[PDB]
Symmetry: C3
């Protein structure tokens, strides 16, 4: 019944789906070591730390294609979409905002939909690197990877923002889950647009997002 | 008597005013921790440290708009304008160069005119970000800010040049004076070019530069 | 007998000469402090460290001219040319690969030809910066320098890749041999393309490469 896979490709990420990535990347960023003291005494700095968690995929991919990293900032509807979350995640009265989304079913859905945004971002840069470079197999793996887990690759430099400098914790030295997966994804869909992979996009686009959500949902059910 | 405000807009920064910024940014850079030993044993490195103090506004703004940061270097009349100061500030015979400009009235005027150069640099990137992005409210605040206090934002990476690595001294964590002001300025003039601010440019362009000079002049009169 | 200098300009670097730079930059990179443990437990990270040794000249020069640093990556015939060496240098069975090229005559020739690749890379960016900026004397010295010893200038950030953070070991603070030479070379050939230097390119292009090889050959004969 492939007729159900076609209805998935018709999902618009701008309203509902862009914020799940913004929230799961901001909730996670706060749960990091000492990130709470940062926001209480330096509001300016915890904010930019959140933006690298959300728009680092766009930020890093812009640095790689010689595109202005301020370009991600121009989308004021997208920037303002992420910063409103950052305020309530931290500065909500009685912290009712974080207490609600931390709830396990809610937190499960919030993180599950960030994995959805991860897929189009791979295909974003894969086709976007296609624009600058037609059939460059590498360049498409990179810019697809750079948008999938950008917040985890600038993480070493994102740590340096909140004040933490751990020069021993690189991403190539030990590949984390959200990154070693986007590497796998950026390679698969590069074989899709390159037609080296025997499955349609809309069927591959749908099967990759499912393995990615079934893990993080299993991850958070066995982490709590 | 607004007729006196119009005569101010007709000020050319290329002869007299470009060097005041170059000098106040190089004099300050030398007065930094251990910057003297750097120039005595590594002339190459104290120089590039001075250039980030002077052209960091241009350097950082180039990195943000995907413009080649070597572009600030092409202006050989401007680069050579700043490096001649760096030699005499450090390597002048009997150090008569620094002893003279350190004099309080002279140092007051030298720093007062760097604040003048700060204003057009804000309007520089505000209109320059307008070129790439028409009515982007954010992008204009950024590239105006990046030219106003560029030497203070690459400062964490500029420290790493002279050898000092202080990963706890970021600019978003504690906003310094020259930076929290340029942020205020980059926002005001972004409301000017965007016509959200009820005052003409040439009247706002003149009133912002005065509050900025009356402070640093009060700063240096109460610091000595 | 200048007729022998003309036959040198007709040397194609793509087959034989591109790999000598790739090997001497990868062999040297492994001989660095703790680089062996990196490759045994983190294959991903020792690789990218090797690429900055080989394509750092292209990588850094791309960052300076606002050119996409992924552009060096698109040349799959060149990227794959360097990565095959990185595998055998490290992961060859019985390490017969490294034991052979470490042999002094072989190591002498391998390093001698990397110095050849150093010359066209200078003239590469000198004429390539000419494209973006006609008679910019500085910009041509830079982009010629950035391709000659790129792996040594991103070295501080390349160290940060393998895990080592030594903020006191900058290149402007103490100019190494491969760098203070490429600075000398990037200046000479900038006077060549600018016609401020009384010698033809093909005669200067040949005399610079000889002084560079006679040193490193004398260096490695007196180092062992
Ligand atoms: Ca560009």
């Amino acid at each position: 019944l492939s007729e159900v896979s076609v209805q998935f490709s018709q999902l618009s990420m701008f309203p509902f789906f862009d914020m799940a990535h913004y929230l799961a990347s901001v909730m996670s960023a706060r749960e990091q070591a000492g990130a709470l003291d940062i926001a209480s005494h330096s509001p300016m700095a915890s904010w930019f730390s959140a933006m690298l968690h959300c728009f680092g995929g766009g930020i890093l991919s812009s640095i790689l294609l010689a595109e202005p990293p301020v370009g991600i900032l121009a989308n004021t509807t997208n920037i303002m979409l992420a910063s409103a979350i950052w305020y309530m995640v931290y500065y909500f009265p009685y912290d009712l905002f974080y207490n609600c989304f931390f709830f396990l079913p809610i937190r499960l859905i919030a993180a599950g939909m960030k994995e959805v945004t991860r897929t189009w971002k791979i295909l974003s840069g894969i086709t976007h690197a296609h624009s600058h470079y037609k059939d460059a197999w590498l360049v498409m793996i990179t810019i697809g990877w750079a948008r999938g887990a950008g917040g985890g690759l600038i993480s070493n430099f994102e740590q340096l923002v909140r004040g933490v400098w751990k020069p021993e914790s690189n991403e190539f030295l030990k590949m984390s889950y959200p990154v070693k997966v986007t590497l796998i994804g950026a390679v698969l869909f590069t074989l899709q647009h390159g037609h080296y992979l025997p499955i349609s996009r809309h069927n591959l686009m749908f099967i990759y997002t499912m393995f990615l959500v079934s893990i993080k949902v299993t991850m958070m059910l066995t982490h709590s």
